[PDB]
Each structure stands twice: as C-alpha cells, then as structure tokens.
Amino acid sequence: SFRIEYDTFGELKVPNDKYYGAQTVRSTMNFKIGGVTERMPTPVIKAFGILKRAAAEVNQDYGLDPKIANAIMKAADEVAEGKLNDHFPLVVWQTGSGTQTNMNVNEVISNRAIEMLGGELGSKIPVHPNDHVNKSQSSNDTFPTAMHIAAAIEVHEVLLPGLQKLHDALDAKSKEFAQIIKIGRTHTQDAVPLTLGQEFSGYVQQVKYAMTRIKAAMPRIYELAAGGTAVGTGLNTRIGFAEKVAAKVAALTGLPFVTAPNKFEALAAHDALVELSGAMNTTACSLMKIANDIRFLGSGPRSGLGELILPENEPGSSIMPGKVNPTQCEAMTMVAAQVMGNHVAVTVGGSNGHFELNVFKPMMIKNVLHSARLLGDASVSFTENCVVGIQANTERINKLMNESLMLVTALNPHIGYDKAAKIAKTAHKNGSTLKETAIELGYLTAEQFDEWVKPKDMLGPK
Amino acid sequence: NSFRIEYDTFGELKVPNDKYYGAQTVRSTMNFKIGGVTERMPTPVIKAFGILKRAAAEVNQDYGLDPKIANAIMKAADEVAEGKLNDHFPLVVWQTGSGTQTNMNVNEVISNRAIEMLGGELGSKIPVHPNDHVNKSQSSNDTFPTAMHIAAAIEVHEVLLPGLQKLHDALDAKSKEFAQIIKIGRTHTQDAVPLTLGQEFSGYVQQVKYAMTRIKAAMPRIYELAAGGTAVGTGLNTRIGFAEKVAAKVAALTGLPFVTAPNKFEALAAHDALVELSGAMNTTACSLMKIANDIRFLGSGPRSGLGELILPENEPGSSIMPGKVNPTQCEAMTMVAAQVMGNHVAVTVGGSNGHFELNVFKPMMIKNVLHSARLLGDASVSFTENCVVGIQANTERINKLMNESLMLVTALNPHIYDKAAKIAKTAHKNGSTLETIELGYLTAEQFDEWVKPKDMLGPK
Amino acid sequence: NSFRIEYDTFGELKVPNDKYYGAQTVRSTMNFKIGGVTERMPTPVIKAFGILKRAAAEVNQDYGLDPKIANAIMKAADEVAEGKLNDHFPLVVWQTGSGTQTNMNVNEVISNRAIEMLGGELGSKIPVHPNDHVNKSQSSNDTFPTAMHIAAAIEVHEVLLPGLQKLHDALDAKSKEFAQIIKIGRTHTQDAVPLTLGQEFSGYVQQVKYAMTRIKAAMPRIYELAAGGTAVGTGLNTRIGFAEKVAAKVAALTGLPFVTAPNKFEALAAHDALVELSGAMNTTACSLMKIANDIRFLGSGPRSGLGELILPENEPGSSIMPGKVNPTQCEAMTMVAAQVMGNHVAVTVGGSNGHFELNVFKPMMIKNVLHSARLLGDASVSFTENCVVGIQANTERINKLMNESLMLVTALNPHIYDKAAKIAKTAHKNGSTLETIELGYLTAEQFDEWVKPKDMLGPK
Amino acid sequence: SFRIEYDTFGELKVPNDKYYGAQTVRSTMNFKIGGVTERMPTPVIKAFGILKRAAAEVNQDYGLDPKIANAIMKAADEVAEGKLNDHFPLVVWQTGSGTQTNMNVNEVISNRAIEMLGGELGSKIPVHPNDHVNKSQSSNDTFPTAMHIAAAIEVHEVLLPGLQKLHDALDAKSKEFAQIIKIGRTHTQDAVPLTLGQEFSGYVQQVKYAMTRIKAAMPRIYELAAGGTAVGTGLNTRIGFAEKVAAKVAALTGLPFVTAPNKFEALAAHDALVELSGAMNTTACSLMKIANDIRFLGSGPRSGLGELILPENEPGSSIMPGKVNPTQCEAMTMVAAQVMGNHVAVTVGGSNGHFELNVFKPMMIKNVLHSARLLGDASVSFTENCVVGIQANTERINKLMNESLMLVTALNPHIGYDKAAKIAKTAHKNGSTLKETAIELGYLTAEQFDEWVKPKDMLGPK
C-alpha cells in the first residue's frame, strides 16, 4: 500500500493512492504545526492549478513538449476543479515563500500527468516536477501569483455576491419601512424623529460603500508576480513569459489579471493583501454597527427597545421557556471581530519583508481568504435568516416616538429653545405630556401645539 | 532673542541663553522634526531620568566622582525629577530608537544647571561635564530602559491603581446600596430572569478588582532595571556593584521594590515587560468598556430607552434638542478603552522588532504604555466622581420592567417548561399578564406562592 | 489672576479675562480632566471648525442672519482657521463622543472675539450669541464630522502626500543613480542571484507610488461633509440648500472637492471613511517599515554588517562607543510605522461601536487619523532630507560581496542545476571561488562567457 | 440510512450513523458560515465531555437516576476521549453563547447513552438531552466552563511543554557557546564584544519569562462558571452544585479548578481569556525576536552575517542550486504574527459583553486555542528542527569580532574617548587596524594596546 521514494536525507514510504512525492512527505515530517485544520486553504491549491495550467500552455512557446504540456494542463485542471484536494496535506506554517506547497503542486501534477501518459508514479518520467511542471518558475513568483488569483476569485465569487444580497435586502426593508416614524437615539438618549426607512438607508449606504471599498482595493490584486523568478530579475525565464502567463490566467478566469509592472515590489512585499484586508476591516466596522443596531432594536420583547421583530429560526430556550435570541446578529458581530484580528495578522506579516522576498506569504493569504469567506457567508446567512424576515412593531414604535420629550425641538423656531427646555424639564418632572405642560406653562394654545408639533413635518429641512 | 554659541563636530549652534540644554539637544531638534510639541518625550520619562541620574551621581562617589560635583548633579537631577525644568526638554518621541537624544538632553540640562549652582558658565561643561560626570558609568542603552521602568512603575502606583481603587470602591458602595432592588436580567439583549441591581454591579466590582490584580501581576519584571548593562549588556566600562547600588538607591528614593535585571541582555534586547504591562491594561480596557457601555445603555431614555439608572447631570442640556443630557463620562471612558487597545498593538509591534543586543523602539513603546496608564487612571477618577458615585436607581421603572417580564414563568419550571412556554407565548400574543388561570395550569393562590422574584435570586 | 464671571444653569464660573472661551468651556474643563495638555483637541480640528463656521456664517445670510454679525463671525472664524487663537482651546479629546464640548468651545471663542470686534462686552453674548448666531442651522452631530473630514483632507493634501512625494522622488533619483551597480539579492536573508541596487530601490519607489495611490483612493468619501444632517440626519430645524451651500463654500475656501454627504444617516451613525483612510495609512506604514528596515540593514557595519550602503552622518558619534554612528532616521520611521498600526486598531474599535443615529467615538477617531497622517508626512520628509538624498553605495564592498556569492553558478543552470549545486557545495567546503575547472564541467574560457553578472539582470 | 426527527419548524432526516439529533441538523442548516475548517475546536468538545461527566455524577445528589447518570458518564467519557469527534458538525460562527454546541453535546451524549441502555436513537428515552444531560445547567454557564477547561488543558499539555523544550535547548546552546566571543550589534551597527552564550542567555530568559507570564495568567482560567445558570443567580440549580462540579472537574483533570467567586463576572465577560491571550501575545513578541535574530545570524553563507550554521532539514533550491533557508524561523515568525492578530480578535470580543452575558464566546476560545496550539507546536518544531542542531562558525565569528572598530572602547578609561574616536575614524578612513593606527597616531605603544585591548577582558564590569 506504499511505494518508496528517496531524498538526500533517506527513503520515504509514499501511499500508492497519493499523487504527492518525497518532497511532500518530507514536508509533513518537518512542519507538524497545528492539525489538518491548518492545511493550506483550498483556494490557494485551486489557484496553483490555474497557474500551472497557464504556465504549461505558455511554455510550449519556449520548448516544452506539447504531449507533456497537454498532460500537465489536464492534471492542473483537475487541481483547479478541486478533484485532488486530498493530495495536499501541508500546513500554512511552512516556508514563508510557500515553497513546500509549490513542490506539493509540482509533484501531484507530475504524477497525475505521468498516470495519464501510462507511466510509473514516483518515476518523474516522462513529466518531471521541476524540469516540466515548474519550468520558467520559482516559488517566489508562483506563490504570490496563486495568492492574488485565490484572493480575486474569493472576492468576486463569495465576498461581493454576499454583500450584494445584504445591500438588496436592506434596501427592500428601507422602502418597506419608509412611512414608519420612529424616535432617533443619539448617545442612546431619546432624540428627534426619523423614518425606520431612513435609519435602514444608512445601513444600505454602508454596505454599498463596503462593496466600493473592496472594488477600490482590487486593482493591485490583479497584478501577478509570475515572471520575477528568484529575486524579480526574471533570471532563467524567457521574454514575454510574464505577459503571456498573466493574459492566459485572465482568459481562464475572466478577471482582468495583468503582469506586475515592478516584480521587485511584487516579491519583496504583499502591500495589496494589506490593502484588501484593510477594505474588509472597514466592511467589518460597517457590519458590526448594522448587526449590533438590529440586535438592540429587536431587544425585549417587553424590557428592551422592541422596535423590530426578528425572524425566529430556532426553537426557544428550555431553561427560559420560549426565549428567542438574535443569533444571526451574534454570528455576524463575531465574524466582524475575527476580521479585525485577521487584519492585524496580515499587517504584521506585510510589514516584515526582508530585501528581495517577503516570507510571511502563507500566513497573509490564509488571513485574507478567512476574512473574505467569513464576510461573504455571514452576509448571505444574515440576509436570508434575519434581514428579509424583519418586521416593524408599529404599535410600540409609535408609542416610543410620541412619548419622546425631544419632540419639543419642533417648538425651537416658534417659542425659542429656553421655553422649549422648560416644557421638557417640567413634563419630565411631572410625568406629564408635552402638550398639556406647554398649555399649563402658557407658552402656546392646544391648537398651536397640534399645528407646530407633527412628527410627519420633522423628517426634512424646511 | 538672546543666544549663546556652542559647538559639535558638525559646526556652531545658537542655544537660547534661558535654556539649560546644549549643542547635542539643538542638533537633535534640527534632525528630528517629527510631530509638534504634542510628540515631546512624556514628562514621566524626563522625571524618571532625574531620579536615575540623582541615584548614579550619589553611587558614583564610590567610583571616583568628586563629592562637590556629585552634590550639584544630585540637586539639579532632583529639580528634573520634581518637574521644575520641563521647558528644557524639547525633543520628540520620534528620535533614535535607543532614546540617546533624550539621555543627552538630560545629561546637558543637569550639567548646565549644576554648573550654574557652582557659579560656572552655561555651555562650558566646566566643572560638570555631561558625559564624564552626569553620564558616568552609563549608556543610553541601559539608562533609557531604566527610565522607562521607573516611569511605568510610578505611573501605575500613583495614577492607574489609585484610579481603579476609587472606581472599585464607588461600584462596591452602589452594589450594597442596590442590593434589595430586583431588576430583569438581559442575555442576547433579550428579557431574561431576575437578579438584583446589586448583583449586576458586583460583576463590575469583580472586573475592577481583577483589573488591579492583573496590573499588579504584570509589575514584577517592570521592577527589573537595566542600569549596569551599558552598551550591549556586558557592563563594559562600569564598576562591579554599580548595577545593584543604583537599583537599591532608586528603590530607596521611590519606595518601590526596584532590583537590577538578572539578565542585562534580555533587558536591552527586548521590552517584554512593557508588552506584559500593556497586556494587563488591554484586559482592564475590555472590563471598563463593558462596565461603561452597560451603564450608558441602562441609563438610556429617559422614556424610550431602558431607563433603569438615573446618571448625574454635570453639564447643562443641548440647545439644539432643548434640555437633552447625555452619558458623557461613559463616552470618555469607552473612547479611552478603544485607545488603550490600539496603543497595545503599537507596543506589541515595537516589542516584536528587537535586533540582536538592542531593541530600538524604546521611546514609542514607553509613550504608548504611559498614555494608556494615564488615560485609564484619569478616566477611572472622572467616571467615578462625575458618574458612578451619583448613580440613582429608577425603582418605579425597574419594578414595572421586571414585574411585566414574561420570563418570570421560569419560576414555574420545577412546579409545572412546556406549560411555562405556553403561558409566556399566550400572554405575549394577548398583551396579558402571566391572568394567562385562563390556561388552568395553577390557581391564583399557587401563582402568588410559586412566582416571587425575591425567591429567584439564588440556588435552593 | 484677572477673571470675569459667567453663569450656566449649574452656577457662576470664573473665566480668565484674557480668554475668548465662556461658561460652557470652563464647565467642560472641570468635568473632563483626562490627560494633560498633550491630550488637547488637535489644532487641525480647531482650524477646520474655523473654516466650517466661516462658511456657515456667510451661507446663513441667505436664511436671516444679520450681515453685520455674519461679517464679524467670518473675521473671528478666519482667525481660528489661521491658528491665531489656539490658546483659547483647552479641552481634551476625552470629552463627549459627539465632540459637543469642542463645538461649544468654538462657538464661544468666535462669539466673544466677534463681540470684541463690534466693541461689545466679553461674556455678554451681545450682539453675537454662540448658539443663535455662530451655531445657527447646526448641531455638534453634523459639525464635528464636517470638521473631522476637513481636517483629515487638509492634513492628507498639505502634509502626508507632499511627504510621500518627496520620498518617492528621492528614492527614484537613487534608483537611477544606482542603476549600473550590481549587488547580490537576498531571499530568506540567504545569498541569492544578482540584481542592480537601482532595481532593489525601484521596488521601494513602486511601494511609495502605490502608497500615494492608496491614500488618494481612500479620499472620495472623506470629501463628503455631514453639515446639514443636524441632530439625527433628517436636517430638522435647518433650511433647504444649507447642506449644499456650506459644502460648496468649504470647497471654494479650501480648493478641495468637498460635497454634501448623499446619506446623512450614514454620515452621523458611522465614520467608515476615517477607518478607510486609516487603512490606507496602515498599508503605507507596512511599505515604509520594509523600506526603512532594508536601508537600516543594508547600511549595517561599517565592517561586521552588510555594509552595502553608506548613510549620511547627521549627529556626532557615541562617546560610550567612540565615533559610533547609527541609522537614526530609519529608527524614527520604523517607530512611526508601528505607531500608525496601533492607531489603526484604535480607529477600527471606535468605527465599529456606533449606536443608532450617532457614532460617539468621534474625537478619538480623528485624533488617531491626524496623528498617523502627521507622523507619516513629517517622518517621510525627515527620512528623505536626512538619509535618502545622501545615501552612497559602497561599490568596492558591494562588488566583493556580489562576485564572491556561490549563487552566481545559477547562470550555469541552462548550460550544464545538479552540476551547478556540486560546484557551489565544493567551493563552499574548500573556501574556493566558483577554480572549482577542477570539477571539469567547463573550461576557464566557457566560465568567463557563461557567468557575467551583467547578463543575469533580465529575461532573455 | 436516515431516521426522522422533528422540531417546531419541520421534519429532519438525521443520518442513522450519527448520535446528534434535530437541534444539531437544524443548526447545520441555519449557520453555513465557513466550511468544515470553521467547526468548533476539538478541545471545546472534549471539555464538554469532562463537564457533562462531572454534572451527571454530581446530579445523583439532586435526584438523577444512577442507572441514567452512569450511562451519561460513560457517553460523556467517550466525547472527552475524542471517540465521537465526527458527531460534532457545527461551526464557531453560531449563537454567541455557544448554545448550538451545548445542544449538540446534550444530543450526542443522550443518544449514545440510549444506545448503551439498548433504547431507540432519537427517542430521548430513557436519557433526555435537557431533563438529564443538561440537568442543573444552561449554555450560559456550561460554554464558559468548557472554554476554561479547554484553555487550561491546552496550556498544560501543549503550550508550556513546548516552551519548556525550547527553554532547555536554548540553555544547552548558551552553555555550549559560553567561550565564543562575538561582536555585539546595536542599531545593527558593530558594537563591543559579548559571548554567543551571553546572547543566547537573553533568549533563555525571554522563554523562561514567557512560561512565568502564561502561569501568571492562569489563576482566573481555573475559575468555572458552572452553577451561574441563566444570568449568574443559579436559579433552578441546587446549593453545592457549583462547588461539587468544580471539585469533580479538578479531580478528573488533576488541575486546580474552583467555582468562580462571582458568576455575574463569569457570564457577562471573558476577561481571563483576554488576560491569557495577552500572555501569549507577549510570548509571540519574545519568539519573533529569538527566531528573527537566529535567521539573521545564520544569514549567508558569504554575503550575510554567517555567525551561526543552522541545520539543513530540506534539500536545497533547484532554481538557486544548493541554497538552503532558515525555514523553522519562518514558521515561528509567521505563528508569532498570527498570535498578535488572534489577540486583537479576542480583545474585540472581550470588550463587547452586554448586561448578563458576553455573546462572543465561541470566537474568543477559538482564537485562544489557535494561539496556544500554534505556539506549543512551533516551539517543539523550532527546538527539534533548528535550535538543538545550531553550530557556531568560530572562524567567521572571530574575524567579525576582531575587525570591529568599536574594540577601541577598551581604551576609553586609558586614553579618553576623544583620542579613541580619532583612532576609530582614522583606521576606518585608511582601511587600517586599530593597533597600527594608535601607534602611527602615537597615543600608545604596540605593547600597551596588546595589554589594554583583550576581548576576553571586555565581558564584565571591573
């Protein structure tokens, strides 16, 4: 059930049902940091598939045998399509260049291509991991290329679609709640009116701006390092390889990938991952506020604010009979907190480049992909399992709004804020309504108050 | 307008005649124009340098320093320590990472003030030489870390812990005062089962008690002083016993248990103790965020919020929303909490980036630690005196909110939770009281026996 | 010693006769004693308030404000904006989370200075009333955010970007100057293949160019002003057109493309644009950490380091290690970089903690954003003028380090990597040159043809 | 291959080969945030096993049938021993109280106990998830209890043993290198001498202090919330239950667990997790410095510092023939960066408690366990695969040290620092040695220099 491969350190049993070789087994022995939970994220593996596919096709221009190139392309496609995920056992906590994973990809594509050409697994015949699959490449330019492909795909496939669904659901609710006049709260204190639609329009703008911020952080993610080789010079690669590989990846993905104009900047730093993480960090601040507001507006049902009725997805507590909780708000705010921590991890990695290579690469892409996936998935879940089903408690909203002492703000231009403040202070002290306190105080008539104090008229400038 | 003329190996320098600093300091002001006066080395570091140079001058008498000179250095150093010469320190945090510029600034000011006391000429280095006398047996590499730990320890003992002690005592007083008031608990922000306002406040008391324990637990390695390590930690060109004598002198002058760092390489190459102390203040900030934010929300209204607490009014109300008054001390405290968390990340990045024999992020690290300690201390005093001590319970409102809670039916769980859930769901749907006799699970007399909030405050 | 007497609803207040602030400001100094003078509201916020109140006064003439009063408010506001009245702002960042105390401080100072210009009595609110005239059509809730964005935009355009532009141009000059010098690359800190010192520096140039692009990309939503939202964003008790006219007036006064925020609820309830701008400065800090740290290590020695660069000497050497000179500008820059990263976390925590219609972490958020922008700007100028422009290449040392590198045998990969690895391993073990003819893989003439560093700088 | 269970929302197919029930399947449908990578960490599941075992035994004092109690204890033990890991499919990104996981544990222990008593899976007969397995408990007090048990075990079993191995290996090297005189570097510049043993003693102290800091952060992790129930009052639990459960967990683990003196503090906040994360954050700063120093000291072999020879564990690069890299230093520094980010995630969660319950619990324990595991595993790997095999390049060290211009510091007390500075400046400008420059300058004789400038004599105070 094992074959035998060798490196300069000894012989290695390799499971016969695995496409990886001696370098990968050696790497599993040397980097036992975290369990299977710490394995290189799938999107990086798939991006390596896309990248090696592109390199194999392009390398035909620079002397790669079409028969071999074709088999490498088919094997690479299987990696990209997630058919060979079980042949990647290596953790994030490896070489800072992601060398072990590049070798893992080179070995798996080599042996799968060998199998397709009816060769012997482990023979490197006729497909050699270094001479064919890694031709014109280093880990130094391929791992960054895989990071940017993986990041771009996760943003377009998961993060932005998630935020789009949340935007559309919040906007629907904004329109639905456009007529409902509620009380504003500033410093958590009773303030002047606004519509529940107006409050929700704030959330809509925040999510719209989140998608703008993420798109604004993508242009330099579309720059691929492929062609820089060891130090960015492109030593032992051919003129045009960098441009052709980038164009091939753009064609394969339908995303506007281009070669990095400066390969030194592309290898020595991952400032684009720090930039993208920063956009997701801003998104996390927006989502924390939206989810926390909805949590508190839905609080009660009796001794909270109780302005919103949130959908019940789970049965109530057995220890507090029938009690139901804003559980999607909790999942979203926990994700928001995680993204903020991930961002600091990305920042520390990004700041610690040395000369020609930043060697924090696996850690940086792990945190960026984690944040993008969590934000995308949480946005869908928060939308489908909370936002779309939110109802307004119109009776309660109307009571809380009408009872607010700060409706006397409407009397500011009519009787001055000194007299308005006396009415509010007196009504508060007496447990009285504003109307009767103003009549008893003799600042206006019952008919004047009913003309000057209409919530419907306090929703815009005059 | 009045300037004297000093020289360094780079040229002549105009030095204001009314300043005790010299050529090294003026040169440093020309080379490090990063941030305005707001970015000047914090006063506690300057004062700690005063204490340290005072200790070194006295101790150096054992190692050949003229008592006449030593005495004048001690008097001038004491003036620095007492904050009499703060205007003679114009240098910013954003200087050499060893804090060399500030050490030289201290050496020059003490030198010229001592010269003045001995009737010499300012700028002459006669008879008190900044390097040969004031900096004798020392480097910036061991003195700046010594000043950091002295400054940090004094700020913790004089500002941070006294602030938290006042907050602890005020919260504990309120816990006792509110021990009889039964309110409704909130979990997930939802109506929960009863607890006393005293019980809720006892949580806050424990958090502040544990904050003080955490800060004290982070101090033992702050009491380790680098003084004696000189350039790289070997103690090259310093005398045997100097390290122990200077530490003992600082302990005697401050009444704090300062000792020489057992490993001077660890003391110069890293400031892990500042990262540790920042971490304690970071935990404290999480506790204070929770306490201040809870009190903010419990005080919300006065009508369309929770309105359980009445917070003292310290300012007149808004003119834009007439008479509106806000939990302003809660805002100051929660903004401070957020600042401490950011400061902690700055300290961590500095702490992680030591190179070989010297960490050269020293000024940035102590600035953030002193900022956090000062803000936490001052905010704790202000939050205590201007909010906590004056908090009142809205007993009428609390009683209504608690009695009306559907989750009082939890008391019926051991008596009759399936049936309890039906009562709560029905009462909720009907806008009825837990009347809902109608369901026929108990008599009016049984409900009055089985549902007493007074009995739901403990295990049985 | 000279005091006048003002009143609020809480009592009488002594106000220094030589101060333009009033009862609200003195009350605020009594209630918010958190940090010393170092924690005072940053000057750029005060100046931005000057610009904003100037704009409001002029625009308010359309909505019934007496031109005589309006004119005096405009002159007094201009003095605030020009930094003539900085001593009349004693309030700290750690106040109300809306920045209400500072808005009142601005309203009072402009009121009393305008009163003085019109020959009235200081403290009288006659004929210029702080609330009725200077604060007309406004709340703190929409004015403080407006001041934050004006202050942030001006600091970015006047300090941060000019600083990075100088650094970009200086690095680019050096890139061109060093375009012919072939050095050894380092990956994992290990000896790698050649690149030019110009190529390495072109990396730094791109990083700074992209930093300026990132900051500019983060500005569009900073140009959105909240002015017109008043209390909760509805614009209650303000006039139609006021929001657009005030934004257009600020744009005209500053020459920056300020516009009214399309959604005033988003503008009051959150400061996501400050979190976005802080994020751009956070990325910039990662770029500058790398550039400054690389130059620090490349300049290391002069004998037992890398010693590829000769950094300008700006200070005299150490007296403790005679003549020793250090990369002090690199230390100032990397300490600033670490500070920006911490500041960013403070901004993020504040930004995440909005409640309903108002985020009340406003002063803390703008303090951290302005701190980061100022430090990055000033450090970029200082690092440029006092280090980068004067950097020299040690061509003799660079040439030795590069020619002796075992990884020049990489050039032989396409000619003869198994054989290339044997040559490197043998030369290393023997302390020999790549002589190692002995292995017999090529002739002395073939090696001289196949191994030219000049040919290893590009793809073929 | 499926049985059928019901909740108030519909019928649910439950795989017959799974011990979880309707609440768990419902939770998998409602919380699709991240894949299997985001599943509740195993140590939390195992800690739930220990906790439910303790509760079942103790509950016999308060009316739980011994027959049932015994079966619950056996099933709980299987969870604790990691025999039933595949029956826990729920993610971290659930209810902030960890309610879904508590229910998952209650269901699995219920059905496994039912199976042991020959009952029908899904019947809740005779072992009821709520009435028996969750007896005297809430999620609010059990999830915090599981967090502290999991955290304490990870610290004692993984983190501290890892740091102990690193401490001992660094101390061995300190002793081994005690005679080797190298050049100190301050600001990265050539400084005065110290032994390689002295430099390594710095690292030893940092790791010793790391273990002290972690132990100093444990006392409040040993406080268990069990007994607080819903809000901390202990409503619907029995007097003595809190103390007995804590004592039982202490006995089962051999760790000094005690009941939290204040259950309000224990439910409303997780300040102890923030405290422990802070200790691991300080540890990360220490390990960043140690790993980065060793990386740079091992740099070359020719155009770096080259003072250390690091063990080769992998074959050299094929693109740069024979090039070998400090890969364990990279794994360690990437872990250090991750711990710093995790710490910010923990801090944000810890700061955001509301009234009687902090609902960031799963996110906080995930980050704490991640940091502890990574630090522990990286410490072992860095020790075994780098530190124990480090050699000194004595020839190179001796050259770099003897050539340093700052050996003239030894002449400070003999000829004053002004004359010493002239010698250094002149020798530098002339490319000369200190000795001959001092003779040519005429500040001392060849015999005086050889007496006054001995590196052996510059290693201590005089």
Ligand SMILES: N[C@H](CP(=O)(O)O)C(=O)O
């Ligand atoms: N990691 C690369 C070499 P590779 O491309 O083999 O990963 C380096 O040493 O710089």
Ligand SMILES: N[C@H](CP(=O)(O)O)C(=O)O
């Ligand atoms: N900064 C110190 C020496 P000093 O004591 O002069 O500050 C160094 O160069 O290592």
Ligand SMILES: N[C@H](CP(=O)(O)O)C(=O)O
């Ligand atoms: N702070 C504002 C009002 P102001 O404009 O008085 O600052 C509020 O109470 O919402």
Ligand SMILES: N[C@H](CP(=O)(O)O)C(=O)O
């Ligand atoms: N989560 C608890 C109830 P449970 O114990 O069922 O998890 C709450 O609502 O406070």
